[PDB]
Symmetry: C2
Subunit: 221 residues, 2 copies
């Protein structure tokens, strides 16, 4: 049968998922649990099946130490967290690129289906979403897809009883340069999108503070 | 106690979550289940607690019909899905805006804490992430946060046994103009980010096709 939760269980999960700034350095996530977290990212949906992401798992302590200088949003977490993921997004993911040829093959499209798909992707990028305005608009489209993978990794971790924190608080140019200089990706192909820490909290879970549902929802009947 | 799943259950959930293009028009999501889905969006994390989203629930059939002309990615789904959400993202969410004053209050910051937070947000936007390059770069930052809310709504729906589909396949300028002309938001304040349909599938769940874990993960020990 299928895995299914009650509404109460779903809400519990989303109140357990919180941004963890204080991790217990004595508790490490198992290799099995961490592989499951990564699989939540891998299995995430993405526009046109583009999967425009790479997951860098930064366990090396010397590299984490170097990041402290320019990563104010995770300074405390770098020494204490079990695992750190830096998510990259694909650069220059144009409809007519070799990257997109591979997207289509993972679907198994023949020449005619590829022709129709290419026309759809061109319309999506050029006219519907206007992504071809600049390199940054096209990069940011791929980056949006990586935030889906991020969200699913945080939620999957929480479902396994593992704490996490999403991270934007770092100097992106310095982070890109540092990780490229370490040989972790080709900077012509990918650039840093967002990061996340994972581990076990050393403090209580902070209560949710959010705008009310009536503030954020408008119903059009 | 806390809600917790096994690795096998988490993976099942992420294989059950699939992009549903074919919905059974006879099956409607209950008001209670749909409120739970919306709460998964509301409870989502967001950079600096910005929550830069609105959720428009488009149930009106005449409005759905109008969208068909310019929404190729959800044409089939518009007539058959139970619920449709169009997610908006905040425009011009500058660190020094009234929008950001409210972000800080939901945290309860006094004048000195606000001063420190404003300095952090200014550094994040101006220098770390370089969001102030253009209106679009700043909008796309908020839009990225809305993709977290999207992902969590899809996953929460799947956990409740409800099918969904994320949607970018529409003309954004036409969609913005149409929904603003209906009075659903102030177009000076928000613009369309991404959409999603929800309902019960009329076909089998399609098997996952993804790049292998070894393709997308790089481990830095
Ligand atoms: C993309 C993103 C980036 C964030 N960056 C940071 C960060 O650098 N450091 C940090 O401590 N929190 C960071 N946060 C956490 C937010 O401040 C947090 O989600 C928000 O205040 C709501 O709290 P909650 O996640 O505990 O519900 C980030 C959140 C998101 C989604
Ligand atoms: C942001 C986003 C936008 C998408 N837009 C559409 C769309 O307009 N129409 C559609 O049928 N599928 C759309 N998809 C679904 C993707 O094609 C799908 O996620 C991908 O092919 C993987 O299939 P799966 O979600 O079933 O695992 C979109 C996905 C995402 C994440
Ligand atoms: Ca099962
Ligand atoms: Ca419980
Ligand atoms: Cl690479
Ligand atoms: Cl508004």
């Amino acid at each position: 049968a299928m895995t299914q939760l009650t509404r109460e269980q779903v809400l519990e999960l989303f109140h357990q998922r919180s941004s963890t700034r204080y991790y217990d350095p004595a508790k490490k996530i198992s290799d099995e649990d961490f592989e499951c977290i990564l699989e939540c990212g891998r299995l995430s949906p993405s526009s046109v099946g583009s999967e425009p992401w790479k997951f860098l798992v930064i366990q090396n302590k010397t590299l984490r130490e170097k990041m402290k200088s320019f990563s104010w949003g995770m300074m405390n977490q770098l020494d204490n967290c079990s695992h750190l993921v830096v998510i990259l997004a694909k650069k220059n993911a144009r409809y007519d690129s070799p990257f997109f040829e591979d997207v289509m093959v993972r679907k198994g499209l023949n020449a005619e289906q590829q022709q129709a798909a290419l026309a759809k992707y061109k319309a999506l990028q050029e006219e519907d979403m206007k992504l071809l305005e600049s390199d940054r608009t096209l990069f940011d489209w791929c980056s949006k897809q990586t935030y889906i993978a991020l969200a699913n990794m945080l939620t999957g971790a929480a479902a396994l009883g593992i704490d996490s924190c999403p991270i934007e608080g770092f100097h992106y140019d310095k982070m890109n340069e540092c990780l490229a200089e370490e040989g972790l990706f080709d900077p012509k192909e990918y650039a840093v999108s967002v990061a996340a820490t994972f581990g076990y909290r050393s403090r209580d879970i902070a209560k949710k503070s959010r705008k009310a549902l009536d503030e954020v929802v408008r119903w059009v009947e």
